[PDB]
Design a protein around this motif. Sequence first.
Motif, short mmCIF file in Angstrom:
data_model
loop_
_atom_site.label_atom_id
_atom_site.label_comp_id
_atom_site.label_asym_id
_atom_site.label_seq_id
_atom_site.Cartn_x
_atom_site.Cartn_y
_atom_site.Cartn_z
N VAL B 114 -1.23 -72.07 69.70
CA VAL B 114 -2.09 -70.57 69.17
C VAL B 114 -3.58 -70.87 68.35
O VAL B 114 -4.13 -69.91 68.14
N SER B 115 -4.50 -72.02 68.08
CA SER B 115 -5.26 -72.34 67.65
C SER B 115 -5.89 -72.54 68.47
O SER B 115 -6.03 -72.42 69.19
N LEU B 116 -7.38 -71.82 67.59
CA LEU B 116 -8.42 -71.61 67.92
C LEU B 116 -8.63 -70.65 68.13
O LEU B 116 -10.04 -69.99 69.02
N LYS B 117 -8.09 -69.44 68.35
CA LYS B 117 -8.21 -68.46 69.03
C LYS B 117 -8.22 -66.65 68.26
O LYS B 117 -7.73 -67.53 67.15
N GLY B 118 -8.56 -66.17 68.25
CA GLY B 118 -8.90 -65.07 67.54
C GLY B 118 -10.28 -65.70 66.33
O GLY B 118 -11.85 -65.76 66.85
N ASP B 119 -10.34 -65.49 65.43
CA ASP B 119 -11.33 -65.70 64.13
C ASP B 119 -11.34 -67.22 63.65
O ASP B 119 -10.28 -67.68 64.13
N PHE B 120 -12.14 -67.62 62.69
CA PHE B 120 -12.64 -68.67 63.12
C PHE B 120 -11.16 -69.43 62.07
O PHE B 120 -10.66 -70.72 61.31
N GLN B 121 -10.91 -68.34 61.22
CA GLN B 121 -10.21 -68.22 59.99
C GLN B 121 -9.00 -68.77 59.70
O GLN B 121 -7.34 -69.50 59.54
N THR B 122 -7.96 -68.31 61.33
CA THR B 122 -6.13 -68.65 61.87
C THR B 122 -6.56 -69.86 62.48
O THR B 122 -5.79 -70.48 62.37
N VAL B 123 -7.40 -70.71 63.01
CA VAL B 123 -7.68 -72.16 63.39
C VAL B 123 -7.05 -72.82 62.41
O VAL B 123 -7.13 -74.15 62.34
N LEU B 124 -8.03 -72.57 61.83
CA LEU B 124 -7.66 -73.74 59.78
C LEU B 124 -6.49 -73.37 59.85
O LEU B 124 -5.93 -74.45 58.92
N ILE B 125 -5.78 -72.43 59.89
CA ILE B 125 -5.05 -72.24 59.04
C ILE B 125 -3.57 -72.68 60.24
O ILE B 125 -2.44 -73.33 59.43
N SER B 126 -3.31 -72.00 61.59
CA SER B 126 -2.34 -73.02 62.19
C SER B 126 -3.39 -74.37 62.38
O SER B 126 -2.13 -75.43 62.49
N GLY B 127 -4.16 -75.16 62.26
CA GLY B 127 -5.04 -76.55 62.03
C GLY B 127 -3.85 -76.86 60.51
O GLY B 127 -3.84 -78.58 60.81
N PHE B 128 -4.05 -76.24 60.11
CA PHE B 128 -3.95 -76.90 57.99
C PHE B 128 -1.96 -77.02 57.70
O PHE B 128 -1.79 -77.90 57.70
N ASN B 129 -1.56 -75.95 58.93
CA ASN B 129 -0.27 -76.89 59.54
C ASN B 129 0.32 -77.09 59.64
O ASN B 129 1.52 -78.05 59.73
N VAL B 130 -0.23 -77.56 61.04
CA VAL B 130 0.37 -78.36 62.49
C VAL B 130 -0.53 -80.33 61.58
O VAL B 130 0.61 -80.98 61.65
N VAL B 131 -1.72 -80.03 61.09
CA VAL B 131 -1.85 -80.94 60.26
C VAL B 131 -0.94 -81.50 59.16
O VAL B 131 -0.71 -83.04 58.64
N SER B 132 -0.30 -80.41 58.44
CA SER B 132 0.42 -80.66 57.59
C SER B 132 2.20 -81.96 58.40
O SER B 132 2.41 -82.30 57.47
N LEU B 133 2.50 -81.18 59.00
CA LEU B 133 3.25 -81.89 59.49
C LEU B 133 3.22 -82.95 60.38
O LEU B 133 4.07 -83.61 60.26
N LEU B 134 2.26 -82.76 61.17
CA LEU B 134 1.57 -84.64 62.01
C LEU B 134 0.98 -84.72 60.72
O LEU B 134 1.47 -85.94 61.32
N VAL B 135 0.63 -84.91 59.43
CA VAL B 135 0.86 -86.04 58.39
C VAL B 135 1.78 -86.46 58.17
O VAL B 135 2.04 -87.78 57.34
N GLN B 136 3.32 -86.17 58.38
CA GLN B 136 4.12 -86.96 58.16
C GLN B 136 4.91 -87.69 58.81
O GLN B 136 4.19 -88.11 60.06
#
Lengths: 50, 462, 52
Positions: B114-136
């Motif tokens: 679902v990231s990269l669609k719509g506005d650019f702020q949603t891609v950073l919010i989904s990418g930060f949440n996916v990057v938070s669980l991906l960094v573990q």
Amino acid sequence: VPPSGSVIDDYVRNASYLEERLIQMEDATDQIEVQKNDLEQYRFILQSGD
Amino acid sequence: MGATKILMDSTHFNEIRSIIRSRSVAWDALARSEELSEIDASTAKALESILVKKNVNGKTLIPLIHLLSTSDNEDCKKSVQNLIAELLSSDKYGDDTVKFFQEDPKQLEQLFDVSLKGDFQTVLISGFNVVSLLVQNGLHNVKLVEKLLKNNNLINILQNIEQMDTCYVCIRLLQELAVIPEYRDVIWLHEKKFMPTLFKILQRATDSQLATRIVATNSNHLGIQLQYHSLLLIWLLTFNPVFANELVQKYLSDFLDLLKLVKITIKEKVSRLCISIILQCCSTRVKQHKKVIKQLLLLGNALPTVQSLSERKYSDEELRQDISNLKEILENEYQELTSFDEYVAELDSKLLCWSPPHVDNGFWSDNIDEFKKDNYKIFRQLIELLQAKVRNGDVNAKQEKIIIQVALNDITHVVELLPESIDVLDKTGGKADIMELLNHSDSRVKYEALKATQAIIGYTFK
Amino acid sequence: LTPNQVNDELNKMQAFIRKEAEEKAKEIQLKADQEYEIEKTNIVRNETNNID
């Protein structure tokens, strides 16, 4: 007086790099002036004595 | 719960999150309008009370991901992703949401689509949440990092230098994802796209003076955090041996301003990563360290900045230990080579250049006896190369000026060293061009030729 | 002069010092992981040479 920050290494290198060439330029200018004054002083003495 | 707060305490993420937190989204009106489910709107509306009331994200994690994947609104997905990202990073509310993401990778893989669609702020919010669980250590997906790096929306949003939050969050996401050793290959494969944005932020901060305070960054924590994030992102990719040699060999011109960036900057964050990047790139473990140390020391001038930076140390001991450790290898790297092989290789290669051991009279005095094998044929070959370069390829040129200046300095030191080399210059014929070369332009090379003519002129008359 | 300017300046200075302390603090472990991996690879090669 510049209104920006202070840089000791950049101000020191720009003065040491100029003084290091200025000392050799002054010594080479004094040695070249003494050698040219000696050879020019002895050239007329040798030509007059010849 | 207990997720990492990397990329969560910055003012850039809170500034973009404040705009989404200022507005309000009604999940009941969107679900009633045939735009979402009633269970996803009821779980999304009830999920807001768990944040302030708590301080179960795992039970409502599936309806928010299903409603975010089925929904096409950037406001509802940005508010649900902002509430899930705010509840995931907290350590006192929504602890089951973090365990559900690491337990099931299908929710993270479906949430990353679902990231990269719509506005650019949603891609950073989904990418930060996916990057938070991906960094573990629970989930390691390199395909999401390679697919996110291969995307055009993330490179287009991170390529924009007019927003510090977009480039700072995009550079902080790749910098946080580059800490893993497995993501260094996939991030290093697509590093050519985000590679100029890290050097452009350092050049923009280096272009700002100290009399005025720039809006992006001159001494602020925003520009120091963006330049420190770019220098930390380049420092994370510089830990590899082949990546430091290939990146230093490819981007050495744009990477040459890192020494001036640490010298112009006063904080130890940019200077510590800048000196640590050159110290890590100048290590013996990297392949071809002599060419990178010679090209970086000659072109970059890391020896005077390291020598002047060694006296003016910082409060951190790692910066003084890194500058003192890199200064010994940088100083001993040029001194470790032979003067006869360097002078014979530079004279035989037809390329003259300055060096730390080339301006010493001991090298010409040591190689003067070894060079004398055909009545000074080596000095006659160097004077024939300087005079042949002076005739073919006339002065007032860029190429002939360096070889004429280095040949005039080496010919002045070799002529001033021994008084028997003056007959080779008069026999060859390069002594006539030395007097005419002083009256031309390039007055530094005219001063070197004036010292070379003064050295031979000193032995004539005493 | 006023206490609001000193409270705002100390409040910004403390948060900037804390953020600079943490941001300067992460690099020690960030380099220590690669140093520990390089030391483990060097010890692994040093054991593998005698094992071979």
